[PDB]
Design a protein around this motif. Sequence first.
Motif, PDB file in Angstrom:
ATOM      1  N   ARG A   9       0.814  -1.209   0.000  1.00 32.73           N
ATOM      2  CA  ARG A   9       0.000   0.000   0.000  1.00 32.73           C
ATOM      3  C   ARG A   9       0.850   1.263   0.000  1.00 32.73           C
ATOM      4  NH1 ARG A   9      -3.649   1.152   5.123  1.00 32.73           N
ATOM      5  NH2 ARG A   9      -4.085   2.894   3.701  1.00 32.73           N
ATOM      6  N   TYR A  10       2.139   1.147   0.310  1.00 34.57           N
ATOM      7  CA  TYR A  10       3.054   2.278   0.334  1.00 34.57           C
ATOM      8  C   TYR A  10       3.821   2.441  -0.970  1.00 34.57           C
ATOM      9  CZ  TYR A  10       2.178   0.723   5.096  1.00 34.57           C
ATOM     10  OH  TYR A  10       1.576   0.280   6.250  1.00 34.57           O
ATOM     11  N   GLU A  11       3.574   1.578  -1.958  1.00 36.62           N
ATOM     12  CA  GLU A  11       4.201   1.686  -3.266  1.00 36.62           C
ATOM     13  C   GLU A  11       3.214   1.809  -4.416  1.00 36.62           C
ATOM     14  OE1 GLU A  11       6.780  -1.739  -3.657  1.00 36.62           O
ATOM     15  OE2 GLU A  11       7.151  -1.704  -1.498  1.00 36.62           O
ATOM     16  N   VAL A  12       1.939   1.480  -4.210  1.00 35.79           N
ATOM     17  CA  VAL A  12       0.970   1.533  -5.296  1.00 35.79           C
ATOM     18  C   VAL A  12       0.760   2.980  -5.720  1.00 35.79           C
ATOM     19  CG1 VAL A  12      -1.458   1.144  -5.881  1.00 35.79           C
ATOM     20  CG2 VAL A  12      -0.157  -0.623  -4.707  1.00 35.79           C
ATOM     21  N   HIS A  13       0.578   3.183  -7.021  1.00 30.81           N
ATOM     22  CA  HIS A  13       0.420   4.517  -7.573  1.00 30.81           C
ATOM     23  C   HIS A  13      -0.908   5.130  -7.138  1.00 30.81           C
ATOM     24  CE1 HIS A  13       1.907   7.498 -10.512  1.00 30.81           C
ATOM     25  NE2 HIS A  13       0.629   7.763 -10.712  1.00 30.81           N
ATOM     26  N   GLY A  14      -0.943   6.454  -7.133  1.00 30.41           N
ATOM     27  CA  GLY A  14      -2.126   7.205  -6.767  1.00 30.41           C
ATOM     28  C   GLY A  14      -1.863   8.151  -5.611  1.00 30.41           C
ATOM     29  N   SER A  15      -2.879   8.960  -5.330  1.00 29.54           N
ATOM     30  CA  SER A  15      -2.815   9.936  -4.255  1.00 29.54           C
ATOM     31  C   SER A  15      -3.282   9.318  -2.945  1.00 29.54           C
ATOM     32  CB  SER A  15      -3.672  11.160  -4.582  1.00 29.54           C
ATOM     33  OG  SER A  15      -3.001  12.017  -5.488  1.00 29.54           O
ATOM     34  N   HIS A  16      -2.747   9.842  -1.843  1.00 25.89           N
ATOM     35  CA  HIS A  16      -3.051   9.350  -0.507  1.00 25.89           C
ATOM     36  C   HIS A  16      -4.166  10.149   0.156  1.00 25.89           C
ATOM     37  CE1 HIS A  16       1.171   8.022  -1.251  1.00 25.89           C
ATOM     38  NE2 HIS A  16       0.678   6.895  -0.772  1.00 25.89           N
ATOM     39  N   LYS A  17      -5.080  10.693  -0.642  1.00 20.99           N
ATOM     40  CA  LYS A  17      -6.250  11.367  -0.109  1.00 20.99           C
ATOM     41  C   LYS A  17      -7.224  10.343   0.463  1.00 20.99           C
ATOM     42  CE  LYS A  17      -9.208  11.504  -4.229  1.00 20.99           C
ATOM     43  NZ  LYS A  17      -8.627  10.280  -4.847  1.00 20.99           N
ATOM     44  N   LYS A  18      -8.079  10.809   1.366  1.00 23.07           N
ATOM     45  CA  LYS A  18      -9.117   9.960   1.926  1.00 23.07           C
ATOM     46  C   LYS A  18     -10.263   9.812   0.934  1.00 23.07           C
ATOM     47  CE  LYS A  18     -11.655   9.178   6.207  1.00 23.07           C
ATOM     48  NZ  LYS A  18     -11.865   9.659   7.593  1.00 23.07           N
ATOM     49  N   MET A  19     -10.741   8.577   0.775  1.00 29.66           N
ATOM     50  CA  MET A  19     -11.753   8.293  -0.238  1.00 29.66           C
ATOM     51  C   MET A  19     -13.097   8.913   0.128  1.00 29.66           C
ATOM     52  SD  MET A  19     -10.519   6.871  -2.862  1.00 29.66           S
ATOM     53  CE  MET A  19     -12.184   6.880  -3.522  1.00 29.66           C
ATOM     54  N   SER A  20     -13.698   8.457   1.224  1.00 27.03           N
ATOM     55  CA  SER A  20     -15.013   8.915   1.638  1.00 27.03           C
ATOM     56  C   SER A  20     -14.935   9.558   3.018  1.00 27.03           C
ATOM     57  CB  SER A  20     -16.012   7.750   1.671  1.00 27.03           C
ATOM     58  OG  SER A  20     -17.349   8.214   1.713  1.00 27.03           O
TER      59      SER A  20
END
Lengths: 206, 243
Positions: A9-20
Amino acid sequence: RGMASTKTRYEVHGSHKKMSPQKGTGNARRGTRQSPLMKGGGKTFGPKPRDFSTKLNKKVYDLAWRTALSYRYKRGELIVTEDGLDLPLPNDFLWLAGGGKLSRELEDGYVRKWVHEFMTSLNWGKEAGRTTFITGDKRPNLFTGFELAGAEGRALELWDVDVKDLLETGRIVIERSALKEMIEDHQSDLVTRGPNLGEVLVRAPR
Amino acid sequence: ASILASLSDNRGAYHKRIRKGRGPSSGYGKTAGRGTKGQKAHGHVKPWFQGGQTPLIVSHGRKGFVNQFAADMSELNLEKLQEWIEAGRIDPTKPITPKEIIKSGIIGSSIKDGIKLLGRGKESFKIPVTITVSRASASAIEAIEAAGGKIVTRFYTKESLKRLVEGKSLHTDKPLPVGKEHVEEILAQARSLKKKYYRLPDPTSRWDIEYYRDPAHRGYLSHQLAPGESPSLYFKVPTGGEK
RNA sequence: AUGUAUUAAGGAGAGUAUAACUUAAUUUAUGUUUAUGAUAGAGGUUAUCAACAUAUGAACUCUUAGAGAAAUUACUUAAUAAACGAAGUGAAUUGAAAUAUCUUAUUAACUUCAGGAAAAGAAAUCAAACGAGAUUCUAUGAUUAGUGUGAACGAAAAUAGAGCAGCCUAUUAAAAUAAGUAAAAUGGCUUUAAAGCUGUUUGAAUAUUGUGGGGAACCUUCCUCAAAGGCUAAAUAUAAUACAUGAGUUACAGAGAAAAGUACCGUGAGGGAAAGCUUUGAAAUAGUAGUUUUAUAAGCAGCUCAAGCAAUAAGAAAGCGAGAGCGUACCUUUUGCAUAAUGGGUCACCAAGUUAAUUUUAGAUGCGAGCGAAUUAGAUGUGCAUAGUUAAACCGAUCAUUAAAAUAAUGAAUAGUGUCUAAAGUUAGACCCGAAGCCUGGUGA
RNA sequence: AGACAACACUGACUAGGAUAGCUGGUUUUCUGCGAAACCUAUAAUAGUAGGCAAUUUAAGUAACAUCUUAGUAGGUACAGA
RNA sequence: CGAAAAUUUAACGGAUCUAAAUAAUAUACCGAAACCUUGUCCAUAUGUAACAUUAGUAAUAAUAUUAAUGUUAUUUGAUGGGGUAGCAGAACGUUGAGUGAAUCUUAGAUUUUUUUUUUAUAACUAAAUAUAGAUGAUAACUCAAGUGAGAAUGGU
RNA sequence: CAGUCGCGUAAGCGGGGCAUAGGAUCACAAGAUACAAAAAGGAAAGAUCUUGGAUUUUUGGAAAAGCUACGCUAGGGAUAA
Ligand SMILES: [K+]
Ligand SMILES: [K+]
Ligand SMILES: [K+]
Ligand SMILES: [K+]
Ligand SMILES: [K+]
Ligand SMILES: [K+]
Ligand SMILES: [K+]
Ligand SMILES: [K+]
Ligand SMILES: [K+]
Ligand SMILES: [K+]
Ligand SMILES: [Mg+2]
Ligand SMILES: [Mg+2]
Ligand SMILES: [Mg+2]
Ligand SMILES: [Mg+2]
Ligand SMILES: [Mg+2]
Ligand SMILES: [Mg+2]
Ligand SMILES: [Mg+2]
Ligand SMILES: [Mg+2]
Ligand SMILES: [Mg+2]
Ligand SMILES: [Mg+2]
Ligand SMILES: [Mg+2]
Ligand SMILES: [Mg+2]
Ligand SMILES: [Mg+2]
Ligand SMILES: [Mg+2]
Ligand SMILES: [Mg+2]
Ligand SMILES: [Mg+2]
Ligand SMILES: [Mg+2]
Ligand SMILES: [Mg+2]
Ligand SMILES: [Mg+2]
Ligand SMILES: [Mg+2]
Ligand SMILES: [Mg+2]
Ligand SMILES: [Mg+2]
Ligand SMILES: [Mg+2]
Ligand SMILES: [Mg+2]
Ligand SMILES: [Mg+2]
Ligand SMILES: [Mg+2]
Ligand SMILES: [Mg+2]
Ligand SMILES: [Mg+2]
Ligand SMILES: [Mg+2]
Ligand SMILES: [Mg+2]
Ligand SMILES: [Mg+2]
Ligand SMILES: [Mg+2]
Ligand SMILES: [Mg+2]
Ligand SMILES: [Mg+2]
Ligand SMILES: [Mg+2]
Ligand SMILES: [Mg+2]
Ligand SMILES: [Mg+2]
Ligand SMILES: [Mg+2]
Ligand SMILES: [Mg+2]
């Protein structure tokens, strides 16, 4: 090789914003999108590039080498020969192959046919397990012969042999010099202070 | 059938693998041997933590100090020195020096700050030898000489003891002379060797100089003393009398 | 994913023979070998029925002259992303089970400057009485010395490996050997009090014929080096490209992307998909067919007892079941739940004690007072154990307290080491999922 | 008007860097044994540590439990003034 | 008799009972997964015999025996049997790997089904449908884990 | 037990009080010890023993006031509307 790898989960691409939002939507509260519970989230304890090699005492590794060499000795599957252990291919074929009259298709088609019929007469071919030829140096006839006819056995160089290779074929055909150098390099537990290592009882009648 | 398909380690070498969180019947199912909703289940407790009560090392304190200057001698006893000679692993006819004590294996495979000869088994030691170490106990000096031998305590370091085993330094039971009447003979020797040998160091501090300056330890600097002189570089032997 | 090699500015708009790429969007020539290659024909659109090597014509607009609402204007043989590097400025989450010093952290971030790398670099260095001999990268040394109330933080010498190179006459052009400097007081930084960096105020000396710096408060002797001037490749960092390998993935996997930063969302910064193929066809769900039961009944739809029906035929009864009884789902959380306490519409798939280093234990097994490692002749490469004792050294099968000592008393003495399988302590995300908040850089009237 | 500053304002949006002694979840079977909700310390009482103490399997036992017989400590029920 | 509360007889469980009530006795019977008996399964033992495998040691030109492991039977007519937190032992299954240039397959390997049998989280027999010669499947032993899901207002 | 003192004819008694109500480490300070001394000779700063100053009185040992009816999150519902 041990090069397998996976993204956490610390390498997968994307932003670390909260979903909901924490509360208000009624659905289960969610954090980042790279959590394993998500579709494209990372595998927590996934494979990673590491070293799988273990350790084995030199003395224990040498005892295992002479135990596999004695397992073949007592069963009669250790057939030592003299030096110059090469397939005695016919002279005519060697004269034509070296000359270049014969094409590759015929040069290979013959080596396969001769090595098959030569190993069958000796009861050394695929019908009777297989044989492994261990020589000190690389010999063209031998190593080339067992490259085109591999069903009849294989050939190896003294430096390219493991404890698993001695136990993988029907018989071991080794050279005198190769054996003297094979048991002399794996007697660490014995040579610690010698024993008979190549002592000649009957000499070759020149 | 085949050998490679008939090999395995002894049964006593294999042990059960406990995989937690893989069903109730396994015995390590839901909680995974953690209990029920504590701090040991949700997070991690600091190892040094005792719940709040002060530890005893804070209630009593740490006692003493660790001497960082003490030498780490390689202890050697007479009970073991006699066993190496009876086995033919140490030649008693030749001088037994640290090079031959480290390469024989009597003290082990570690070169420490020195070699001290102790007196365990000093009652059955009757082999005349010529040994040279960094120190020796009082019972080991007279036990070596009672059999008809000679002992000498020299000054070594950790680096000089390593050069003796490597052959980068020649062993000698005497200190470097001092004065202009020795250069011609000492420089003569250096050229003849036809190699770059290192020199063995001599003591420099007060304590180190004094240890090898007294005959009680058979120090190699004891020849610099007079019969009435004391080893100490500061104290002197008072005179007995009425005056 | 790692390794090897090579290379050292990137993107977009529009157009075009839809394998062919720039308004010339399939240019024009050379040499060699051509089936014993390389790795005696047909065919210029019914084309490119030839690969390798070396040349060669053409290559639009914007980013990118000036202006502007980028791909326009107006001119003209106007033109260089990101990451990596050095310096400057410099947090907070976090730990200390609160919290100020501390830790997080010479971190993230921002700012300037520079190159294919940069930086650093041939001792005013370390050592300890023996000596080593520039810088950079990796491991050990080292959960060490040490610091700190604590939590934690944390060297150097040295060793091994990768590279190796020295110089000023620098292989690219530089010193007449360095003065407001070394240093001191004071305020800070770094840190162990030394050394090092620094604002303010002050302020030295001139070579081993012993002048100056350092050797962890400090003084002295000795050792050691020679600041206030410079040059220097490699091993190292990042990105792109190609290739090699795989008890790596094989389509909700691999990457975010098998047509992707595209569709889509947002004023904006920004967020960011789904979708393989001709194969196989699970469960749930739906409509029917066969056998069987069902319109007098209060079943967590199961279980115990069981009439009857059910095979055109010798033999062969799975299934459905009237009727009788027993039975108040599951999980979580709790002293205790059918509970009207928590959770779930069903099914399929995804989804949680793992890896690394370190420190231990058990079992098995190798060697054995040695073990492990590592290597014509010799040397070399961590470690643990072989001796105990004390705060510590001396001392030592003996040691410590007894202010002198002394069997006076009291305590402590004898197989280790490596490996594998498994369980573990410690530090790392540390079994998994989940906050509100705090700080920094940007975006929007 | 703690009003507005583009879903959001007792201080917006976006990107980067967290923790959570609290809650929830933690997936195959068979077999053997089998607790506690107590004490002490703690800015602790929803936690933790050390005990008591569950488990594993080795060495020991003049072990431990119960009864009998003789002995010992201690003042309750009862009874009394 | 005292004796009065709001859905309904309303604390004999109900039917009902002049005992089928109450008090003092007697006997038979019923009655639990308790106990007994006959079998079975499992765990731990104790000796013996036999079968198989592996590895040794002897005999053999006119087979015996030793040790380990697996297994059945049998001796003592052996002992033992609920279980949360938790601890421990022993196994199966899934994916990939070695032995494997091995074994098997139109005389049907493989077919998500159905069926049969075996102390059985598993495999096996047969049947039906389709058609593969290996880019197919596979015993046995071993090696490494992205290895087992009715549960997270979980995700697609 | 060793050391060496008091009282007592002697036996002997004495390591405060008839018994039960006074907290460490760190830092700091005063004596002794002679352990180690970062090149070396010294020293500084450390180490051992004895002792002192503490509503360290939250006395196993924080330098510490409130409000939120605008409150936020994670929970429990020890009953709080
Ligand atoms: K455990
Ligand atoms: K829970
Ligand atoms: K604290
Ligand atoms: K320390
Ligand atoms: K300074
Ligand atoms: K995908
Ligand atoms: K279906
Ligand atoms: K899993
Ligand atoms: K508002
Ligand atoms: K039980
Ligand atoms: Mg964030
Ligand atoms: Mg992924
Ligand atoms: Mg392994
Ligand atoms: Mg175990
Ligand atoms: Mg359990
Ligand atoms: Mg546990
Ligand atoms: Mg707990
Ligand atoms: Mg406290
Ligand atoms: Mg412009
Ligand atoms: Mg322009
Ligand atoms: Mg290092
Ligand atoms: Mg100078
Ligand atoms: Mg300065
Ligand atoms: Mg100085
Ligand atoms: Mg200076
Ligand atoms: Mg210079
Ligand atoms: Mg894999
Ligand atoms: Mg999938
Ligand atoms: Mg009816
Ligand atoms: Mg409750
Ligand atoms: Mg209901
Ligand atoms: Mg409910
Ligand atoms: Mg629901
Ligand atoms: Mg899974
Ligand atoms: Mg010792
Ligand atoms: Mg109880
Ligand atoms: Mg708590
Ligand atoms: Mg009385
Ligand atoms: Mg009634
Ligand atoms: Mg029973
Ligand atoms: Mg029972
Ligand atoms: Mg049970
Ligand atoms: Mg089928
Ligand atoms: Mg679910
Ligand atoms: Mg000094
Ligand atoms: Mg010094
Ligand atoms: Mg308290
Ligand atoms: Mg107390
Ligand atoms: Mg309650």
